[PDB]
Amino acid sequence: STGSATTTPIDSLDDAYITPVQIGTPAQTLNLDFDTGSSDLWVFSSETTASEVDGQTIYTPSKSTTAKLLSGATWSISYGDGSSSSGDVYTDTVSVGGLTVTGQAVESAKKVSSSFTEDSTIDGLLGLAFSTLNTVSPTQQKTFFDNAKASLDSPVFTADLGYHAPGTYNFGFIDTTAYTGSITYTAVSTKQGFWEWTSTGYAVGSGTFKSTSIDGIADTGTTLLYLPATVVSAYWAQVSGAKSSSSVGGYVFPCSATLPSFTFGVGSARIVIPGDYIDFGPISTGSSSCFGGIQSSAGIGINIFGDVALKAAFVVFNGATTPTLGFASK
Numbered sequence: 001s002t003g004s005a006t007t008t009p010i011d012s013l014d015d016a017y018i019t020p021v022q023i024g025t026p027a028q029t030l031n032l033d034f035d036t037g038s039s040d041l042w043v044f045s046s047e048t049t050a051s052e053v054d055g056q057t058i059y060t061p062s063k064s065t066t067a068k069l070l071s072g073a074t075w076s077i078s079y080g081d082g083s084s085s086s087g088d089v090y091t092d093t094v095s096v097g098g099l100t101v102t103g104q105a106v107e108s109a110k111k112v113s114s115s116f117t118e119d120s121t122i123d124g125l126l127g128l129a130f131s132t133l134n135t136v137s138p139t140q141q142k143t144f145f146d147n148a149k150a151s152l153d154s155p156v157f158t159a160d161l162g163y164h165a166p167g168t169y170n171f172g173f174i175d176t177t178a179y180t181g182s183i184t185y186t187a188v189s190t191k192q193g194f195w196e197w198t199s200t201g202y203a204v205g206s207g208t209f210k211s212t213s214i215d216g217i218a219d220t221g222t223t224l225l226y227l228p229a230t231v232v233s234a235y236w237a238q239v240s241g242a243k244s245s246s247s248v249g250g251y252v253f254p255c256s257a258t259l260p261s262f263t264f265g266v267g268s269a270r271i272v273i274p275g276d277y278i279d280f281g282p283i284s285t286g287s288s289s290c291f292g293g294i295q296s297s298a299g300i301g302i303n304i305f306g307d308v309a310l311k312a313a314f315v316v317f318n319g320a321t322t323p324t325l326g327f328a329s330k
């Protein structure tokens with residue numbers, strides 16, 4: 001089997017991407033944030049505190065003839081931005097772009113933090129990291145990809161995120177027309193439950209390439225590119241007037257500046273992030289100070305190849321017995 005679904009930026013800045021997901025019988029279609037940095041499928045629901053729902057489409061398990069309450073199961077998750085959600089668990093039928101999993105754990109939110117409430121375009125998350133990170137207690141549950149893997153033509157999924165444009169998540173096959181050149185594969189550590197890999201280095205603009213190992217995770221659920229302070233300083237040094245602002249919470253730059261590209265290494269291969277991918281617009285409405293899309297990972301404790309990086313590539317998440325990651329230019 002295979003599945004294929006279009007993923008869409010939620011706003012003009014590509015702050016996140018949503019992908020339609022069918023849940024239950026008859027189908028309830030929710031637009032979910034596919035997140036390769038976490039492993040819970042959770043949704044706004046009929047059980048979510050009314051004051052915490054503001055525009056989202058909700059899952060109503062009582063209207064799904066295939067929904068079954070998972071007795072005694074609860075979940076609670078917190079993300080790197082301080083956001084959180086929690087609730088109980090159903091199993092139900094879940095389909096993504098024609099690919100169907102029966103008995104998928106669907107985690108129904110009773111509570112969500114304010115940042116989720118405020119984001120009307122995101123109806124929940126679909127985690128695609130390794131199932132070891134799933135928060136369902138007292139019995140941990142499997143991700144959608146884990147549940148589908150054995151039925152797929154090939155045990156893989158691919159992320160093809162667009163810059164200010166639609167993109168695609170495919171399951172079970174590699175679309176050889178979606179990229180240029182070759183896919184370079186690189187080793188993955190699953191020891192922290194992430195798609196964790198080691199970049200071979202970087203370049204800033206037309207600068208010489210610096211060979212240096214950068215360990216980080218491929219995370220579709222993070223907007224920006226988070227890299228070591230040394231690297232990030234080297235990047236913003238090439239932008240006149242850029243500086244790190246504590247008040248704003250990172251590097252900002254004059255909106256009139258021309259941003260240099262940023263290149264990261266995958267083995268001997270190179271992925272080039274165009275400069276305008278790194279522009280996240282005025283820090284507040286009407287400001288001529290803009291927020292940078294490359295930021296220091298010093299506070300986070302881990303390097304994150306988020307959407308800013310991933311949308312510059314066609315990315316293969318290979319879930320073979322020994323998982324690997326593939327990157328191609330596009």
Ligand SMILES: O[C@H]1[C@H](NCc2ccncc2)[C@H]2CO[C@H](O2)[C@@H]1N1CCOCC1
Binds near residue numbers: 015080119221
């Ligand atoms: O990018 C954010 C994510 N929200 C993106 C977002 C979604 C929707 N609208 C705006 C932003 C969530 C998931 O992991 C973190 O929090 C991630 N960062 C990690 C390190 O820097 C701090 C936060």
